[PDB]
Structure 1
Amino acid sequence: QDRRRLLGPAAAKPMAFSSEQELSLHTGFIENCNGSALVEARSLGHQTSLISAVYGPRSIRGSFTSQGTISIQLKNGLLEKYNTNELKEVSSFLMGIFNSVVNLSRYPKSGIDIFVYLTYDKDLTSQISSLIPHCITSITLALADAGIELVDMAGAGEANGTVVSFIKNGEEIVGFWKDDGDDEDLLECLDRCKEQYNRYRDLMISCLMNQ
């Protein structure tokens, strides 16, 4: 047990155990939040749904800050299990992309609270590499819905556990991740992921066009 939460019997232990994808977007479907997005991706491999919610611009007064900042919580899925550290890494990754895409100068004393809910990931057949397009798709939508400034829509592909995020129509790269891909994938992946980004670009623009 603990003083902040009920944790039941503590000598108790867990149970031991025995474009190729479609992204369909949704926004503005739940309220107590400045904007929300929903991304569900279906593929042969795995089907996944990611919820995001973005809270604020919030004022953080009692101190003057040079410019605003972005704070990313990833929350462990209810059907996916990951180490806390990996979630931190990915939070750190996404922050550094968003730092580059969100313009921050129209908002003094700002903190923005971004929540990434990695709710459902299910296989019909690392892992954390694959859901990075979907996280980036979700969060961008949310910043757009709320009315937070952005340089270009952010969006990425995943080619062979390698994730490359671009802005400006494939022209500039705002981040690169390679983890357990093969040596010298560079050309295949960049070509393949450009296709992916241009393809999900317009999908996000068309979600934003129903409102």
Structure 2
Amino acid sequence: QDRRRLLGPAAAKPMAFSNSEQELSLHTGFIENCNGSALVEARSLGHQTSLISAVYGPRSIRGSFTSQGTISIQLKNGLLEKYNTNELKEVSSFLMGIFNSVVNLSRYPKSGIDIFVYLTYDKDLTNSQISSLIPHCITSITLALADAGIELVDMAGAGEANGTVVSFIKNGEEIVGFWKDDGDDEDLLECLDRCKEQYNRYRDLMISCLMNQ
């Protein structure tokens, strides 16, 4: 099959089988390989998620010259739940826009800050699901950047409510990103309030993690 991997025999076919509000866990700086890293685990109802973020930078960019730094974000599929490459790219773009509003790029001329988020373990226990993972990604990237020592304007956090994801800064006064799939009609005000509550809780736990730990 592939000349770079061992994928086994081709006639083989994969095994198909027959028939509080949120619980968080935060850890930072456990990857010596990079500059900043974070572990974010969430458990709620019939879905738990364990994702790992890793920040590599600021490192060299050998092309032209830039007064500010350049951020790149890449999401990788984990072991269990898989997602479309397109969908992972879309979230990556959405995350790039968010942290280009938070990261003090002016302090890193001709430098690159490459942020990796590994969707290691995403279990679906219900015996576009990507929308519920987005706030946890932002939490991991924020923790990793702060752990790396990359300057941030403010602790960026987010929340999710009925397929709507919105990330806040400045005590929830302003918005650094808005995401909406499916959901209902004229439910904007309700989503903003519910997400700001999650944003506030996540921000408190993040600060608590960056300080005490």
TM above 0.5:
yes
Shift of 1:17: 4.2
Distance 2:119 2:139 in 1: 13
Give distance in 1, aligned partners of 2:124 and 2:84: 19
Which residue pairs with 1:71 in the alignment?
Answer: 72
State the Cα deviation string for residues 159-183 of structure 1 (Å, max 9, x = none).
1111011100110001111101111
| CA apart distance, 1:23 | 1.6
Structure 2, unpaired ranges of 5+: none
TM-score scaled by structure 1? 0.94
Please give the per-residue CA displacement for 1:137-196, whole angstroms capped at 9, x wherever unaligned: 011000001110111011101011110111001100011111011111111111111111
Matches within 5 A, 1:1-211: 1-18=1-18, 20-125=21-126, 126-211=128-213
Query: Could you give the per-residue CA deviations for residues 58-102 of structure 1, whole angstroms, max 9, x where no partner exists?
Result: 011352124211111110121011111000000110011011111
Give the Cα–Cα distance (whole angstroms) in 1 for the partners of residues 46 and 189 of structure 2: 24
Task: Select between 23-32 and 150-159 the one with higher mean Cα deviation.
Answer: 23-32
After superposing the two structures, state which structure 1 stretch, 179-188 or 65-74, moved more: 65-74
Task: Give, in whole Å, the separation in 2 of the partners of 1:127 and 1:198.
Answer: 23
Task: Output the CA distance in 2 between the equivalents of 1:146 and 1:156.
Answer: 21
The separation in 1 between residues aligned to 2:99 and 2:182, in whole angstroms, is: 24
The Cα offsets for residues 87-140 of structure 1, whole Å up to 9 and x where unpaired, read as 000011001101111110111111111110011111333100001111000110
The structure 1 segments of at least 4 consecutive aligned residues displaced by more than 4 Å after TM superposition are none
* Cα displacement (A) at 1:44: 1.1
Deviations 1:20-73 (A, max 9, x none): 102221111231111110000011121111111111110113521242111111
Aligned-residue RMSD, C-alpha = 1.5
TM-score (norm 2): 0.93
Measure the CA separation in 2 of the matches of 1:11 and 1:173.
52
- Change in Cα spacing, 1:121 to 1:108, as seen in structure 2 (3 Å) is same
Inter-partner Cα distance in structure 2 for 1:73 and 1:4 = 22
* Displacement of 1:11: 4.5
Shift of 1:3: 3.2
Cα shift at 1:10: 3.3
